[PDB]
């Protein structure tokens, strides 16, 4: 009798100890008489611990409980494109049922060691500071760690917007579909975000998964995992996907809540022992597949929220260890006028130049190393002592390179527009220009090439590299413009 059903013994705080259910599986979905569904996480002889996806004011002692017989899964396929679903994969935008092609589980095994490929495919983020210093690669997971109100989401958001350059195209192997995963955010914000995507015709290749704070803790916990399965889909069918988690810091808080309430002993700061295993079996799910598998791939941009700039924290360290580098963002640099406030000193990419564009690779070789020297000289000129020709020369250029990296939000720049700017920087053609001039210089120089030397922009774009001839013309195009005005 009780094999497929059970009576509730206690209920509260989204937890429900039901009695019976001696044939239910681990992590299996269930349904109460009230209509509200739940998830079984603790299997014990006496009772079964279940977590509620909705309010608990509806469940009461002695209520009937039924099982689903299936592990919590979510609808997947192209249909979701442009739609906004919740943890479970149900539509929340109000635009009809989700037309899915298949259904995959929440928890999926990470791709094999055999079916992998070294990351070689770039991920144009449109951010010069990024594509030049810490390039992204199809199949890696680049962290975006920083304090509140710095510009973490910004970096991610602009990326999706930049993809419009190829998603409107015909070629598939070049496009890059985007999966935003809002977790812990308020519905107000999510609404405004999705509004902004549409204002840029970026919603058509974008899938959004909402797990606002108001929803139940188990939703916020499951949100990322289900969302990942959504993206994995493209990876398997030989397409490219780009998922953004924002943010795992909240997810751990959520997952911490189920543990404590299920009366599971806490580790450090109340987080469950396996809190690491929470993000490890998530990020590893994204990687570059073998040619046999489809040459498919899934890129990940995890987001973390530090307190007081303390990266030595419990959760952040757990994730820094997994991610293929991190884009550290400091509040202090933001006010100084460095926007986006990317600290090069601490931001790195483990894939490195392999992922970066070949063209942009040439124009900026030791650029990151040079910016390191700049901060070295910038700190030493604090003494208030005169500087020779060497220490002032690099100080002049290093100060302007930092000003060239500043780029406005919602303004992704193609590759053909980044190369030229960086070119004139690393060489030293901006040294002879005032700092408050670098601003308009960028826009003016671009308009110059798009009008006159447009042929070059077309070669850099297609070729993606720099030939002996292309450098010659590019060289002369730069000097000619400096002379102007």
């Amino acid at each position: 009798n009780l094999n497929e059903t059970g009576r509730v013994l206690a209920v509260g705080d989204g937890i429900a100890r039901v009695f019976g259910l001696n044939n239910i599986q681990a992590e299996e979905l269930v349904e109460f008489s009230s209509g509200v569904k739940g998830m079984a996480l603790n299997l014990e002889p006496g009772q079964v611990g279940i977590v509620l996806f909705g309010s608990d004011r509806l469940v009461k002692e002695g209520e009937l409980v039924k099982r689903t017989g299936n592990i919590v899964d979510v609808p997947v396929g192209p249909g979701l494109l442009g739609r906004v679903v919740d943890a479970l994969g149900n539509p929340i935008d109000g635009k009809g049922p989700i037309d899915a092609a298949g259904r995959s589980r929440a928890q999926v095994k990470a791709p094999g060691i055999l079916p992998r490929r070294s990351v070689h495919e770039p991920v144009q983020t449109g951010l010069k500071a990024v594509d030049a210093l810490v390039p992204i690669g199809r199949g890696q997971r680049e962290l975006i760690i920083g304090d509140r109100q710095t510009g973490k989401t910004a970096v991610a958001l602009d990326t999706i917007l930049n993809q419009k350059r190829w998603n409107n195209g015909s070629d598939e192997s070049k496009k890059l579909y985007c999966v935003y995963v809002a977790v812990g955010q308020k519905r107000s914000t999510v609404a405004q975000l999705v509004q902004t995507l549409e204002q840029h015709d970026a919603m058509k290749y974008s899938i959004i998964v909402a797990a606002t704070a108001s929803e139940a803790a188990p939703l916020q916990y499951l949100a990322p995992f289900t969302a990942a399965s959504i993206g994995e889909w493209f990876r398997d069918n030989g397409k490219h996907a780009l998922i953004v988690y924002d943010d795992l810091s909240k997810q751990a808080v959520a997952y911490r809540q189920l543990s404590l309430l299920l009366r599971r002993p806490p580790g450090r700061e109340a987080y469950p022992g396996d809190v690491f295993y929470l993000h490890s079996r998530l990020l590893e799910r994204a990687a570059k597949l073998s040619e046999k598998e489809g040459s498919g791939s899934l890129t990940a941009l995890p987001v973390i929220e530090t307190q007081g700039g303390d990266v030595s924290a419990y959760i952040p360290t757990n994730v820094i260890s997994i991610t293929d580098g991190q884009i550290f963002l400091e509040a202090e640099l933001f006010y100084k006028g460095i926007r986006p406030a990317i600290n090069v000193g601490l931001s790195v990419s483990r894939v490195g130049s392999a992922a970066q564009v070949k063209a942009l690779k040439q124009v900026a070789g030791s650029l990151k190393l040079f910016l390191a020297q700049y901060r070295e000289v910038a700190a030493f000129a604090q003494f208030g002592s005169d500087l020779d020709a060497s220490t002032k020369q690099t100080l002049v250029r290093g100060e302007r390179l930092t000003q060239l990296l500043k780029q406005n939000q919602y303004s992704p720049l193609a590759t053909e527009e980044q190369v030229p700017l960086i070119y004139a920087g690393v060489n030293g053609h901006l040294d002879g220009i005032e700092l408050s001039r670098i601003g308009e210089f960028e826009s003016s120089f671009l308009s110059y090439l798009k009008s006159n030397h447009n042929e070059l922009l077309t070669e850099i774009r297609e070729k993606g590299e720099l030939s002996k001839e292309l450098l010659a013309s590019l060289k002369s195009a730069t000097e000619s413009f400096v002379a102007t005005f």
Binding site: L9, K60, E61, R148, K186, Q195, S214, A216, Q307
Partner: protein, 472 residues
Amino acid sequence: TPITGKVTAVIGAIVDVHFEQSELPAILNALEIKTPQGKLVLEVAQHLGENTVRTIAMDGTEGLVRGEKVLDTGGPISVPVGRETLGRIINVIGEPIDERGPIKSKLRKPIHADPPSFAEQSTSAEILETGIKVVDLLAPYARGGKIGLFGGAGVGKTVFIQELINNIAKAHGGFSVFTGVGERTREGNDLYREMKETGVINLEGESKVALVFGQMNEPPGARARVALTGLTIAEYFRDEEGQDVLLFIDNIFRFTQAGSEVSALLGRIPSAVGYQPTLATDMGLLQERITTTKKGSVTSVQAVYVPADDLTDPAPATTFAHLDATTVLSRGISELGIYPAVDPLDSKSRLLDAAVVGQEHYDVASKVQETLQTYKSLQDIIAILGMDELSEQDKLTVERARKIQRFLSQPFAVAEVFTGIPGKLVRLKDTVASFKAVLEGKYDNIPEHAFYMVGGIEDVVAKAEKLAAEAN
């Protein structure tokens, strides 16, 4: 037949009720107990099992005897809603506490209700002029948006709000709902005086605002529900009436503070810092209800308390994410004598964009930040060496910076009894031009003192001239 039960345990603000009948009341329901003093209201929290339930007292549990009879209400704590609540002081329970007779309202909705659907969410980018320099210039508030006023103890969170009510509630045109959660009972009374004198609340006439109080003197159960009571009233005018409403809350922190006192007795495993595991959710369900929908707009000014001046504290740290505008007060600034002690650096808003406040406004603001920032980054040097060691360029930025900081201060009409200086209301238009003029270096001759507690930019030059005659 009324459902009845007996008490089995009484620990603090937590009473365990048991029902002989096989029908148990759901969660979030109310209960009442007969006493010589009146009636004690209970609220279901969780079903411990064995036809026993755990509930949270709404008032003192002194005198409660084990096995005493308990009557069921049949519905979650409800409170009267409608224009009938205006000009009346409602209690956490939903009963008049101003001694002016019962609130004859038409309908009575429960304090517990689910947050607006994602599709119902409506976003807006309209600016809201307050008159406050440090705000309308740096982090302007938005119409029907969420406002937050963080800060330690005695930094200026209430006094800041009082001014907002003296400048917006008057020229508003809609309705207002003030709810004092865990605050000095005295401030409530004096607040009542102000509403009467200003005429916002006329006993004989009509009123424009409703007063709901769950002061700190009240036990934890109340300090936990009061916020919900006040909110239910305001969401009525939002959907039912579909009219602009100003929701003033102070202080919102008490909401989680009051819940962390009982979480222990409820049998929950304390999370780090002592706060209950479900901090994120509870705080979530509250903020998600306080928002603008497609039926009406609501501007909320919530004040948040900062324990031990720690912004990393889980309580306030989970509040920022639920705000479209954040104005943090650092006691390190108030002690300087600068008021309001707004910290330009930490302060953020969503309206700080050139596509809204204008290109010039964006540039002027940014310049102010950079200047203030450069002063902070050299602060270490100043205490050690001094300005003598500062470079020519750096030394000029400091003075200018120090001028901008002092200029940020603004005399408050509400705080005139503290500063002894008549209030000063400055328009956004003049404020921008003002700082912009200071950036251009058109006032580097005027002494810094002339920027301290000054209203309009004209008043600076005026005050500078007055100091010439005082010099002997």
